[PDB]
């Protein structure tokens, strides 16, 4: 209702960098809020695409940001009569970024890896890798839970079981309040998908440069399955955390599997041991139900609610015709140990090919009325198709069907305005939470400030 659309602040990265593909608020030890921006096609120092991360200090005028340094040199280690290799070209560093406490976690989902042993190999494959920075100290660590030293032949001999070679670890990412990093890896187990969890503290304390294959004893990966419903499901395309089992001592994970069950799509709510607590099924094949997931209590009862995006949903129209517009499904969490039911509300896009529900951001309480709010992105929405972000305020009944406000892309065609979103943080200290919107296509980020 009260995001100011006139007085925008623009932050810009380099041409072709995809600055804005991912972003988050980051708060330093002093409490000062900056903005971490991912730029997965940033040129490395040798004119090859590696990706990069930028830490932007809050300024009304915006502008350019300093590049948060990471090692972009490939590594080789000849050990145990094997040759371990990392390949950072086209790794897409900054395809996801997430902040927790005084730590920034930026992932490169397409970092490749290989292991050679005489004439055999593991295969050069995108295991992914996350880079961890503690900016105020300079400490760096990495986490790459899918790297292995098993040769190609052994996978063949074991029917490709526990095959983590194509994980793309850090494709999606989230951190719990306690400091557990949870990574989505949709290529896990030959494209079923998997989740990798490890405490940030333990990632830092177990990492040393040059080792490449090491143990994080406290880590916890999801499991492989022979259930064909899961094949090519891309379980971990999106990930979130919340409280859904009533036990405040346990944390629950929310996982998007947008091509689950022959492209029907699904989202799952799991315990931290990866036991399924609930499954929400897709409504329509190829709709990409589970592309985006969001967790926030929208109806003021203190129980987290779930929002799922299906940005290629095709709406029925007159004369048996279908129109790709996207959809978002609101699931309100009921009282007691009851299951999540059917959706309390369906929000459907109105622009053809708009991809409404491509991103969903909790805004916190934008208008301070007691109910939390959300923003939904339609990155090719609006009459012109430049992109649109729509704000929905919470209420006793859940969310409103009519948006309280529409933000139109200030960037040209192709910007993908809204493809990334973050809210729920007060960047200027006026007492109202603000919204950051990425437009990777235009290499920029727009900051909207909430006003009284």
């Amino acid at each position: 209702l009260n995001l100011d659309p006139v007085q925008l602040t623009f932050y810009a990265g380099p041409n072709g960098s995809q600055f804005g593909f991912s972003l988050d608020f980051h708060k330093d030890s002093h409490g000062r809020v900056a903005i971490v921006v991912g730029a997965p096609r940033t040129l490395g120092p040798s004119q090859e695409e590696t990706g990069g991360v930028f830490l932007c200090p809050w300024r009304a005028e915006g502008g350019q940001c300093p590049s948060l340094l990471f090692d972009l040199r490939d590594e080789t280690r000849n050990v145990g009569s094997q040759t371990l290799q990392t390949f950072k070209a086209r790794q897409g560093l900054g395809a996801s970024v997430v902040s927790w406490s005084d730590v920034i976690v930026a992932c490169a989902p397409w970092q490749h890896w290989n292991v050679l042993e005489k004439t055999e190999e593991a295969e050069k494959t995108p295991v992914g890798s996350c880079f961890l920075a503690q900016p105020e100290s300079g400490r760096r660590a990495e986490y790459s839970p899918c790297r292995g030293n098993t040769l190609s032949r052994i996978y063949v001999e074991n029917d490709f079981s526990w095959d983590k070679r194509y994980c793309e670890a850090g494709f999606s990412s989230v951190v719990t309040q306690a400091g557990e990093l949870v990574l989505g890896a949709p290529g896990g187990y030959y494209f079923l998908g998997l989740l990798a969890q490890a405490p940030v503290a333990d990632i830092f304390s177990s990492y040393r440069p040059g080792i490449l294959l090491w143990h994080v004893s406290s880590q916890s990966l999801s499991f492989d399955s022979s259930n064909p419903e899961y094949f090519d499901g891309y379980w971990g395309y999106s990930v979130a955390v919340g409280e859904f089992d009533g036990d405040l001592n346990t944390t629950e994970y929310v996982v998007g599997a947008p091509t689950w069950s022959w492209t029907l799509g699904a989202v799952e709510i799991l315990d931290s041991y990866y036991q399924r607590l609930h499954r929400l099924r897709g409504e329509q094949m190829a709709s990409y139900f589970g592309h985006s997931v969001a967790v926030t209590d929208v109806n003021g009862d203190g129980r987290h609610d779930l929002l799922v995006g299906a940005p290629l949903y095709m709406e029925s129209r007159a004369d048996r015709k279908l129109a790709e517009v996207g959809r978002v499904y609101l699931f309100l969490q009921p009282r007691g140990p009851h299951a999540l039911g059917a959706p309390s509300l369906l929000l459907t896009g109105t622009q053809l090919y708009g991809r409404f529900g491509s991103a969903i951001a909790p805004l916190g309480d934008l208008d301070r009325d007691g109910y939390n709010d959300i923003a939904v992105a339609a990155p090719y929405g609006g009459p012109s198709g430049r992109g649109q972000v729509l704000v929905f305020l919470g209420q006793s009944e859940g969310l409103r069907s009519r948006p309280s406000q529409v933000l139109d892309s200030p960037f040209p065609t192709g910007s993908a305005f809204g493809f990334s979103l973050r809210g729920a943080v007060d960047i200027d200290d006026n007492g109202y939470p603000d919204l950051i919107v990425g437009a990777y296509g235009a290499n920029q980020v727009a900051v909207y400030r909430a006003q009284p």
Partner: antibody
Amino acid sequence: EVQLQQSGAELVKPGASVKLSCTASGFNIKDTYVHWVKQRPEQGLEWIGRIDPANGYTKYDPKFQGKATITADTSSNTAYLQLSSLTSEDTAVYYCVRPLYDYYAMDYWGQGTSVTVSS
Amino acid sequence: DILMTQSPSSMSVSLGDTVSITCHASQGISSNIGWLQQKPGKSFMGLIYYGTNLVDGVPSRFSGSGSGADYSLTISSLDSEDFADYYCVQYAQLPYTFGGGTKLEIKR
């Protein structure tokens, strides 16, 4: 606290076999490679082999091929070393070992199991 | 197999001394070297992994150095507890192989 707890001293006859155990405490045996090392006063330290208890795959120094058989059982969190065809050269202290962080390292050691081969 | 030659096999040293044990590999092992300590009648404790990294809990007076085929463990300011045996192990190649060992002995 990571701790490898090995089985007790063995007194065995030549030509017989013996099976030493090493149980994980404060961790799961499948977490890492587990190695077996031999120590003798004069000949020093010799690496025997390793197992990946997650899948049972083993490697051996050819010197011990067909004498040593390393196994593991994740149910009982135990790794085992079996020596067949015992000779006087097998009189030694035997250790199980595992790395701290580095996959390939040799950082944590059991207390040792003494084997004495005698008639 | 890679031959690990350790030197010296013993040294007679005093409390407070700084000492170095060297290890020569028969080929380059690019820091894939560990250092181990065995106190009298005791089992083993790992000191260093991958050339220079201290195992958790190991005192700062221990340090590793070297490259290629030649490495060193230095103990700065010997404690009474440091009079023990020390061994290198390489894991560049299987089979893993060990040094002959160095015994730190008390000078008198």
